[PDB]
Amino acid sequence: HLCEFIEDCEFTVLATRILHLLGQEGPKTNNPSKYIRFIYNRVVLEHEEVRAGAVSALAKFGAQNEEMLPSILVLLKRCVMDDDNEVRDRATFYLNVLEQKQKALNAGYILN
Amino acid sequence: KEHPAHERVLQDLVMDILRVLSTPDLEVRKKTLQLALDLVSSRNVEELVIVLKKEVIKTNNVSEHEDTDKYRQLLVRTLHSCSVRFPDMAANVIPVLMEFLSDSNEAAAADVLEFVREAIQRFDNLRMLIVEKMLEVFHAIKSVKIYRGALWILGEYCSTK
Secondary structure (H helix, E strand, C coil), X not given: CHHHHHCCCCCHHHHHHHHHHHHHHHHHCCCHHHHHHHHHHHHHCCCHHHHHHHHHHHHHHHHHCCCCHHHHHHHHHHHXXXXXXXXXXXXXXXXXXXXXXXXXXXXXXXXX | CCCCCCCHHHHHHHHHHHHHHHCCCHHHHHHHHHHHHCCCCCCCHHXXXXXXXXXXXXXXXXXXXXXXXXHHHHHHHHHHHHHHHCCCCHHHHHHHHHHHXXXXXXXXXXXXXXXXXXXXXXXXXXXXXXHHHHHHHHHCCCCHHHHHHHHHHHHHCCCCC
16 A cells, blocks of 8 residues: 555655665565565656665665575666666666675675 | 758858857757758868857857757757867867856756766866866855766766875
């Protein structure tokens, strides 16, 4: 309900809060395809900023992986990628950051 | 124009004609600009450029742009193209300056466009000055646009360690 409605019940501000929370929660509650499905959408919206949250939430999530995620988790960041300079940069950088640590290690430091 | 035997001169006579444009009507003007761009094998250029600069001054003036603004953007496009081909010069520096003066996004977008481009183009030298120029501009200024500007530039970085 939240997901859907909020989508078409708007307000960016809400998203900030919820994002943050969601950010922690991920794969302890599974339903991956859906959740992904959502996540993509959330990003769908413009705003470098709106887009950005899906990646950040993801870090706790990614790290944990779910009912299918690690392989693919690795595949995805690749599949979804962006320019728009500082938006480019966000993709690049997260990557670059990613680039910079053994992704397993990477996850551990950053997450905390 | 498909008199592709296309004589030198003719291209050249344009400016004269173009002068008339100062008695505006953008829409007409606009048609001109496209038209204009074409002839230049990166030449009859300077005289023009100069003239452009004249335009530029003219553009300053006191203005109450409403139509001409548009023109400016266009001009810049028209202008942009040339440069690609060309080796260009001080004139260009001036845009940079000019741009600093200004206050609306579309230009920033162009600028940015330039950011991109230039990032590709790198013969460099100019940039550095400009970067300096910019440094001034920057010091000299505040805004989201700027704020954004900083970001990329910052991103870019080099010397004066």
